[PDB]
Amino acid sequence: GAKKSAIGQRIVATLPYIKQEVPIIIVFRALGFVSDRDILEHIIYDFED
Amino acid sequence: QKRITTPYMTKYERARVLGTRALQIAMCAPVMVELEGETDPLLIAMKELKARKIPIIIRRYLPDGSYEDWGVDELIISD
Amino acid sequence: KSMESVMVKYDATVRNSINQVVQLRYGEDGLAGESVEFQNLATLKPSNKAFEKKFRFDYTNERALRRTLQEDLVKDVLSNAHIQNELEREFERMREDREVLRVIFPTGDSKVVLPCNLLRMIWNAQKIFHINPRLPSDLHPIKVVEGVKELSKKLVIVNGDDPLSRQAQENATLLFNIHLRSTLCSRRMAEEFRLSGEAFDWLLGEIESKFNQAIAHPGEMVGALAAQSLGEPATQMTLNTFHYKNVTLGVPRLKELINISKKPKTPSLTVFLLGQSARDAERAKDILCRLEHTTLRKVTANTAIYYDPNPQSTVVAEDQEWVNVYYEMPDFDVARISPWLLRVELDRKHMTDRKLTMEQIAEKINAGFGDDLNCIFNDDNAEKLVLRIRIMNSDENMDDDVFLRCIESNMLTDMTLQGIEQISKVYMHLPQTDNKKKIIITEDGEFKALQEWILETDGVSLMRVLSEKDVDPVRTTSNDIVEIFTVLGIEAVRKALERELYHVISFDGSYVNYRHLALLCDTMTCRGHLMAITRHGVNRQDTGPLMKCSFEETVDVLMEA
Amino acid sequence: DDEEETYRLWKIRKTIMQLCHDRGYLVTQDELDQTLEEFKAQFGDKPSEGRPRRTDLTVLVAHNDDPTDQMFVFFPEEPKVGIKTIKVYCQRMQEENITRALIVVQQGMTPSAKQSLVDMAPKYILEQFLQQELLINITEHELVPEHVVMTKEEVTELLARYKLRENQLPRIQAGDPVARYFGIKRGQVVKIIRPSETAGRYITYRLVQ
Numbered sequence: 001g002a003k004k005s006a007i008g009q010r011i012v013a014t015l016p017y018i019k020q021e022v023p024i025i026i027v028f029r030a031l032g033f034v035s036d037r038d039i040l041e042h043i044i045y046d047f048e049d
Numbered sequence: 050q051k052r053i054t055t056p057y058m059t060k061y062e063r064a065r066v067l068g069t070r071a072l073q074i075a076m077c078a079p080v081m082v083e084l085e086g087e088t089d090p091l092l093i094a095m096k097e098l099k100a101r102k103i104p105i106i107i108r109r110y111l112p113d114g115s116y117e118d119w120g121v122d123e124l125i126i127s128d
Numbered sequence: 129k130s131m132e133s134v135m136v137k138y139d140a141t142v143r144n145s146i147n148q149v150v151q152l153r154y155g156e157d158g159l160a161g162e163s164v165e166f167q168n169l170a171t172l173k174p175s176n177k178a179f180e181k182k183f184r185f186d187y188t189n190e191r192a193l194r195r196t197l198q199e200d201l202v203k204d205v206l207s208n209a210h211i212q213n214e215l216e217r218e219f220e221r222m223r224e225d226r227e228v229l230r231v232i233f234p235t236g237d238s239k240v241v242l243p244c245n246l247l248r249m250i251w252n253a254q255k256i257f258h259i260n261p262r263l264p265s266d267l268h269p270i271k272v273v274e275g276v277k278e279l280s281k282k283l284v285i286v287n288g289d290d291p292l293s294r295q296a297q298e299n300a301t302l303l304f305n306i307h308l309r310s311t312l313c314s315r316r317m318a319e320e321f322r323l324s325g326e327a328f329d330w331l332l333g334e335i336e337s338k339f340n341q342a343i344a345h346p347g348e349m350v351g352a353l354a355a356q357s358l359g360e361p362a363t364q365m366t367l368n369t370f371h372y373k374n375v376t377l378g379v380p381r382l383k384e385l386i387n388i389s390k391k392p393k394t395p396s397l398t399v400f401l402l403g404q405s406a407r408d409a410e411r412a413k414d415i416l417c418r419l420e421h422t423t424l425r426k427v428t429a430n431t432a433i434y435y436d437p438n439p440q441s442t443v444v445a446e447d448q449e450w451v452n453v454y455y456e457m458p459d460f461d462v463a464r465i466s467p468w469l470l471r472v473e474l475d476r477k478h479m480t481d482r483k484l485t486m487e488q489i490a491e492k493i494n495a496g497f498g499d500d501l502n503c504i505f506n507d508d509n510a511e512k513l514v515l516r517i518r519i520m521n522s523d524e525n526m527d528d529d530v531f532l533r534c535i536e537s538n539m540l541t542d543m544t545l546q547g548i549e550q551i552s553k554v555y556m557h558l559p560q561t562d563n564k565k566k567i568i569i570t571e572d573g574e575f576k577a578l579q580e581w582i583l584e585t586d587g588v589s590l591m592r593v594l595s596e597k598d599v600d601p602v603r604t605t606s607n608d609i610v611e612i613f614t615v616l617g618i619e620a621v622r623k624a625l626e627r628e629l630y631h632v633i634s635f636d637g638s639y640v641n642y643r644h645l646a647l648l649c650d651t652m653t654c655r656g657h658l659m660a661i662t663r664h665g666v667n668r669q670d671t672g673p674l675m676k677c678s679f680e681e682t683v684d685v686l687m688e689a
Numbered sequence: 690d691d692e693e694e695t696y697r698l699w700k701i702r703k704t705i706m707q708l709c710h711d712r713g714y715l716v717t718q719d720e721l722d723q724t725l726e727e728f729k730a731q732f733g734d735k736p737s738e739g740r741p742r743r744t745d746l747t748v749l750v751a752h753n754d755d756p757t758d759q760m761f762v763f764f765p766e767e768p769k770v771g772i773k774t775i776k777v778y779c780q781r782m783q784e785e786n787i788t789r790a791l792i793v794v795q796q797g798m799t800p801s802a803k804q805s806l807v808d809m810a811p812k813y814i815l816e817q818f819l820q821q822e823l824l825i826n827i828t829e830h831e832l833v834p835e836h837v838v839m840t841k842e843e844v845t846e847l848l849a850r851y852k853l854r855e856n857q858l859p860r861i862q863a864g865d866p867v868a869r870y871f872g873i874k875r876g877q878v879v880k881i882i883r884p885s886e887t888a889g890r891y892i893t894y895r896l897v898q
Contacts, residue, residue: 006534053287054138059345109346112137112147113852127341141851148857156891232884240886292850302889595824597696602831612832617867619881620832642887656860656898 052117054109058124062107066121070094070103098126130661131651134351136344142647146670150651154344155643158285158300163342165245168238171222171310172229176573183222185215185269185315196318198264211270215314218273222313225306235567236575241642242304244338246311249331250321257327265322269314272328276312279332280305283339354644361633361640373555381632385625387660388610397590397606399583403598406580412556415598416583417482417546420554424543427484429473431536437467444471447514454504464521468528470536474513482546486515493539551587558582591615613658621658625649691737697824698741699728701793704823705748705762711828712872714750714760749787760789768796772805775815782813790815793823816872827866834883836867844878847894858896873897
């Protein structure tokens with residue numbers, strides 16, 4: 001595809017009792033943690049990487 | 050004439066001629082050789098073949114529908 | 129279940145169930161595979177001097193001719209021009225057959241399977257008659273010649289008088305007559321065997337009688353006999369041959385041959401080389417690199433998207449020199465200058481191994497994508513090879529940053545530097561076996577084998593590989609048969625399938641007669657196209673209704689009927 | 690480039706001069722072994738902005754047995770061919786009174802053009818090829834045996850000697866590379882001559898349907 005060739009692969013999740021795939025940032029925000037400085041500290045534990 | 054087939058009695062026709070002629074002897078048909086103390090209806094039918102004296106005609110069917118009839122006397126016994 | 133009802137009909141033709149001719153003669157010869165055995169030709173292997181030395185029978189020596197023949201015949205052979213003439217033509221009829229054998233058997237072997245043994249029949253006649261190989265014999269040579277002719281006349285496979293039935297007979301018993309003429313020549317049977325006159329008529333009368341009982345019998349179920357003759361050697365086949373790069377052999381390769389499924393687990397086209405490139409490793413390696421597929425991300429070290437709003441800004445410290453010596457020759461400032469830059473670094477290791485330098489890359493990354501891009505580059509004397517690119521500024525009078533990242537992520541995989549797209553890895557080696565060697569017939573007439581470089585790939589697109597230069601278009605082939613079907617024809621599929629069956633059978637030193645392979649690979653490609661021996665392969669044929677009811681769709685097809 | 694382009698045009702030409710020689714046409718001897726530099730000097734050094742235009746390459750040949758039936762071959766200029774473009778040729782055949790014609794398509798054709806050639810059945814028979822396929826003579830390959838087409842008088846001798854019909858022969862579809870190389874129509878019989886190791890030589894027949 002001439003669209004996602006540049007951005008790359010997207011992390012997806014397949015929760016139970018639902019039909020469709022879901023991006024992970026969405027299911028992260030459904031627990032609170034709407035900010036993207038707070039989400040990216042549960043997933044990456046050191047910002048020198 | 051125009052006989053296009055082989056003059057050799059094939060392997061299968063020798064096994065069916067010996068079977069039929071042996072069954073006819075068991076049902077009291079007249080023999081055509083001078084047997085000597087022989088009783089097995091299939092041992093007799095084998096020495097009639099060695100003497101070329103079996104009264105049966107073979108009808109070979111070509112694959113185009115024709116046929117021709119060879120007397121067992123006329124064929125060269127394979128064995 | 130495929131080949132159940134093939135059999136030999138009473139006119140020696142191998143017909144199907146609906147009387148569709150499969151072979152004009154069983155096994156192309158007409159003999160049963162039960163009364164044959166191995167022999168040697170002994171005419172194709174020797175050289176042009178030993179041949180004329182051992183198969184000549186000169187008649188002007190007067191003393192060796194006195195040594196071998198009696199006194200009654202040695203005065204007749206020396207004093208008759210007709211005899212000397214007839215002894216001169218058999219050598220001519222022999223040389224022609226020697227030349228035909230060299231094209232029937234190109235490799236040069238001599239082990240063939242034939243009817244009644246000849247050397248053993250000569251050895252027997254040498255002892256039924258107490259032949260003493262010490263005294264002169266009494267066998268007139270023109271008797272040998274004419275006896276062999278008369279015997280050759282009484283060996284009919286195809287009985288007829290008109291042409292097209294008098295040349296198929298000469299095609300059927302072509303090899304056996306050559307063998308019989310080369311073994312029973314006048315020189316050999318007056319020099320080595322030394323048979324008498326009485327012991328020759330016996331041999332002639334026995335050849336014919338033990339030949340006439342090798343002919344096939346009209347009625348044997350040849351089809352079923354050839355289906356279990358190949359299936360039980362499928363049991364000896366190894367399951368997965370990893371002990372041996374990658375080749376598929378054994379029973380999985382068999383059912384890759386059983387069906388013609390589009391997916392061989394390792395398609396590979398073996399390639400051979402035509403010119404001195406087949407001899408020296410350097411041209412072999414250059415055509416190797418020229419055939420292999422190479423993309424951009426294989427020749428790059430790292431890339432970086434910088435931001436030069438002016439070409440004189442040169443954010444990175446040291447690229448100012450070459451970009452400037454371009455800048456005093458400033459061209460293509462047509463609309464603007466794009467503030468967005470793309471910088472690429474290359475690895476000369478991966479560059480030179482394929483004999484590439486960024487000049488050809490520079491034109492083709494332009495010539496092939498458009499002119500929306502613009503490439504300036506270094507000089508290769510500088511150790512690191514960098515070339516910088518900007519978009520054509522005609523677009524600036526959808527964001528250009530994401531577009532430039534899309535282009536960057538698109539060019540390193542869709543580069544198409546060299547080679548054919550699908551073939552990925554190509555190896556190189558020269559064999560030691562006589563299987564892949566180049567066997568030539570020298571001027572003196574001897575089979576000589578030569579080691580030559582061959583190439584083997586992993587991936588198949590043969591129609592292009594054949595069209596390239598300095599690549600042998602004759603001997604190059606592929607191990608996938610649907611490709612040969614589309615590219616080469618149908619008879620090529622027949623022969624390739626036969627060859628692959630032979631190679632998978634004779635892998636562990638086993639052996640299976642030829643008639644079975646021929647019959648199978650003939651009934652498998654009889655209706656013109658490749659129908660696999662599968663479920664929906666025998667489903668579409670001119671067969672009755674009560675046979676397709678024995679296979680899992682009884683009721684619907686019988687309702688149709 | 691043009692060196693690749695002057696090479697291909699010589700190669701493709703040399704192939705066709707044999708293809709028409711196989712079909713039984715008259716081709717002069719030296720035309721078969723026309724080496725590269727001889728071709729480069731006759732028709733032009735390069736076709737890139739050159740004298741060889743992919744026209745000036747066309748060939749017209751006459752049969753051996755009869756000087757009237759002739760065959761033409763065309764080399765279209767556009768990558769893929771349209772509709773009237775072949776009618777340009779159909780007109781060129783209409784004017785010169787030639788029915789046998791070939792077109793060496795460069796890279797492809799249109800589905801509309803596929804319709805436009807199957808219509809003139811009883812007249813103006815044309816054969817459509819590809820530039821790639823003519824780059825190599827497949828007939829001289831190793832696996833491919835020797836084919837020979839039989840006249841309609843010989844075919845009636847088989848079916849009367851082996852007492853056959855014409856349905857009982859082995860079949861070959863008129864879409865495989867050697868069925869087109871010889872220009873074969875349905876209802877013809879081709880003869881294959883291959884050497885075998887048990888007999889020495891074996892002749893088989895195929896019915897093209």
